[PDB]
Design an enzyme around this catalytic site. Structure first.
Site, PDB file in Angstrom:
ATOM      1  N   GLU A 110       0.820  -1.205   0.000  1.00  0.00           N
ATOM      2  CA  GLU A 110       0.000   0.000   0.000  1.00  0.00           C
ATOM      3  C   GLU A 110       0.856   1.258   0.000  1.00  0.00           C
ATOM      4  O   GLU A 110       0.462   2.275  -0.584  1.00  0.00           O
ATOM      5  CB  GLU A 110      -0.933   0.000   1.209  1.00  0.00           C
ATOM      6  CG  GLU A 110      -1.839  -1.203   1.283  1.00  0.00           C
ATOM      7  CD  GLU A 110      -2.658  -1.386   0.022  1.00  0.00           C
ATOM      8  OE1 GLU A 110      -2.914  -2.547  -0.356  1.00  0.00           O
ATOM      9  OE2 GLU A 110      -3.041  -0.368  -0.593  1.00  0.00           O
ATOM     10  N   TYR A 119       4.335   9.842  -7.409  1.00  0.00           N
ATOM     11  CA  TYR A 119       5.160   9.876  -8.611  1.00  0.00           C
ATOM     12  C   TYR A 119       4.362  10.359  -9.815  1.00  0.00           C
ATOM     13  O   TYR A 119       4.853  11.173 -10.604  1.00  0.00           O
ATOM     14  CB  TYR A 119       5.743   8.482  -8.848  1.00  0.00           C
ATOM     15  CG  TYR A 119       6.502   8.285 -10.140  1.00  0.00           C
ATOM     16  CD1 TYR A 119       6.045   7.391 -11.100  1.00  0.00           C
ATOM     17  CD2 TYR A 119       7.686   8.970 -10.389  1.00  0.00           C
ATOM     18  CE1 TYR A 119       6.737   7.192 -12.277  1.00  0.00           C
ATOM     19  CE2 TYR A 119       8.386   8.777 -11.569  1.00  0.00           C
ATOM     20  CZ  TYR A 119       7.904   7.886 -12.508  1.00  0.00           C
ATOM     21  OH  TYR A 119       8.588   7.682 -13.684  1.00  0.00           O
ATOM     22  N   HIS A 217      -3.983  -9.214  -2.514  1.00  0.00           N
ATOM     23  CA  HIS A 217      -4.663  -8.611  -1.370  1.00  0.00           C
ATOM     24  C   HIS A 217      -6.084  -9.144  -1.242  1.00  0.00           C
ATOM     25  O   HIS A 217      -6.527  -9.514  -0.149  1.00  0.00           O
ATOM     26  CB  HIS A 217      -4.683  -7.086  -1.504  1.00  0.00           C
ATOM     27  CG  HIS A 217      -3.325  -6.459  -1.534  1.00  0.00           C
ATOM     28  ND1 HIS A 217      -3.141  -5.094  -1.554  1.00  0.00           N
ATOM     29  CD2 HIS A 217      -2.087  -7.006  -1.549  1.00  0.00           C
ATOM     30  CE1 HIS A 217      -1.849  -4.826  -1.582  1.00  0.00           C
ATOM     31  NE2 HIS A 217      -1.186  -5.970  -1.581  1.00  0.00           N
TER      32      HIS A 217
HETATM   33 FE   LIG Z   1      -4.598  -3.463  -1.675  1.00  0.00          FE
HETATM   34 MN   LIG Z   2      -3.504  -0.981  -2.918  1.00  0.00          MN
END
Ligand SMILES: [Fe+3]
Ligand SMILES: [Mn+3]
Ligand SMILES: [Fe+3]
Ligand SMILES: [Mn+3]
Lengths: 306, 306
Positions: A110, A119, A217
């Site tokens: 993250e 960026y 994730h």
């Molecule tokens: Fe994530």
């Molecule tokens: Mn993420």
């Protein structure tokens, strides 16, 4: 007095959480190894083409620029919201070292994702304040983040009761299934659509990296919810199943409102209706992964290339 | 209502902690970039030589094996203690996005370090229970970890008062300056001493990687304490300075007890006296970095190669 695998649990475990071995959740350990092997930096992707297309006049339509600014503004601060939820809520309640091991990987990813939008913002010369405060200025973005934040705040303002563990499950759904596994995927489809048109390819390539992390994730978080369901069958009540089905429903209506505000008129090969189809298809897909009755009729994937 | 750099602070800041830009603490952002560029995996280091030397009879003296087991047993669970302190204590109190950005990097590096000792334990065929429960079975190791844990627990069981911010400073000293910047450095010197004798070079090489991370972890934490001192001059009272000088003193006596128990008789080129000299030299070095009167007389570095 060493730790046995039987003593380890997803939540409310009494085993020494400081002792990684013996591993009980190999699936959690496997995700950590996969996350590490996906090491990447946003500064590895060149932005010269994207900077030229951005500064040019004919490079993007006004609808494309607004769609890009809203998508970036949402993602720029959403990654911090997911990271803070991991640290302030998820980490405490998962009483398991190998799962915490992956949470540390995910939290850092993250930070990489947040780095990606510093960026991009710095490369394209965007207004930092406009981009990072966008989630408090745009109602469609604000409503989405405020909705997910409530499940984080509710954990912090209530001791191992069924209500407490259900509230933590609501948090995992809100952030792993909904935030990362639905809202991000929809936002990914919008940006990758430009990339398939060879527009903003540097941003699109970074989104491909984020999507690869996002897949793990989501995969981890579904496994967590499912693993908690195995060890706590009493938590997955019919009422709570409808609660989760209702959460998915509201989350879809918040993204419909977001998609409409982000794309009033559809751009080339992308509109709010197609994003409504993808969100509806993904939502049904999340229901199947959680053993939930789908909330929408059979919907095809408008973007089979995702 | 966008965030100005003046609104951002190390602790008790009112600025939106979810907004990375504008950066106020460039030094914190710089550490995050340096941490990311130090990407490494413990499985990248071959253990074949170390496994052969371990299984062999003449490979290591009984004193070397005990020194190795105690050092590994201490580090195996210490990394989890540092990581948990970052997440459960440090992250909450640092009200700053760029610093939290590095904390996510540091926390993940702690997971890599914890991974390093699962890999060493699995490679050498050590008893997982003996190694990871060693910090509750060995008094010298247990006293060190229990001493550092109190500063983590005290934060969790007390709202921005001077006592609260001082208690958080005690935690930063205990874990950044003492745990990572003193106890780990002493343990690093012991293992790298074997590496300089071409013994357990695979373990030594992994310790070189951990030491590189540890140098940034310490550098960041000193910067945090110093940056908090700048913005909160009222916190660095003469009484609190003596508190920190006393913490360093106890921490040295705990490591002296550890060094003696770990090396009853000195091994080739290493003993408890030399480690007492290095700990005393490092401790004085930490005092200078914190603007503290040194707690020991001028002591040379017994290991200038560190
Ligand atoms: Fe994530
Ligand atoms: Mn993420
Ligand atoms: Fe460290
Ligand atoms: Mn470490």
């Amino acid at each position: 007095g060493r730790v046995d695998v039987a003593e380890k649990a997803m939540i409310n475990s009494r085993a020494d959480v400081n002792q990684l071995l013996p591993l009980k959740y190999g699936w959690a350990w496997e995700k950590y190894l996969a996350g590490c092997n996906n090491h990447w930096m946003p500064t590895e992707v060149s932005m010269q083409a994207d900077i030229a297309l951005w500064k040019s006049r004919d490079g993007l339509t006004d609808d494309e620029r607004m769609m890009l600014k809203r998508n970036l503004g949402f993602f720029a601060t959403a990654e911090s919201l997911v990271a803070n939820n991991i640290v302030l809520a998820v980490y405490r309640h998962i009483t398991n070292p190998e799962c915490r091991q992956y949470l540390l990987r995910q939290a850092f990813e993250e930070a990489v994702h947040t780095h990606t939008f510093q960026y991009i913002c710095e490369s394209l010369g965007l207004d930092e304040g406009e981009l990072f405060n966008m989630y408090r200025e745009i109602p469609s973005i604000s409503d989405k983040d405020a909705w997910a934040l409530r499940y984080t705040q509710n954990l912090e303002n209530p001791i191992g009761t069924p209500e407490a563990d259900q509230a933590f499950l609501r948090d995992l759904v809100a952030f792993y299934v909904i935030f990362e596994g639905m809202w991000f995927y929809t936002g990914f489809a919008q940006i990758l659509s430009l990339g398939r048109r060879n527009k903003m390819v540097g941003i699109a390539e970074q989104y491909q990296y984020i999507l690869r992390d996002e897949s793990i994730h989501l995969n981890f978080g579904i496994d967590c919810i499912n693993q908690i369901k195995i060890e706590n069958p009493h938590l997955w009540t019919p009422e709570f199943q409808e609660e989760v089905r209702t959460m998915l429903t509201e989350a879809c209506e918040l993204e419909v409102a977001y998609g409409r505000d982000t794309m009033p008129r559809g751009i080339l090969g992308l509109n709010a209706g197609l994003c409504e189809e993808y969100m509806r298809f993904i939502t049904n897909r999340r229901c199947a992964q959680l053993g939930l009755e789908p909330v929408f009729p059979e919907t095809a994937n408008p973007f089979p290339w995702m």
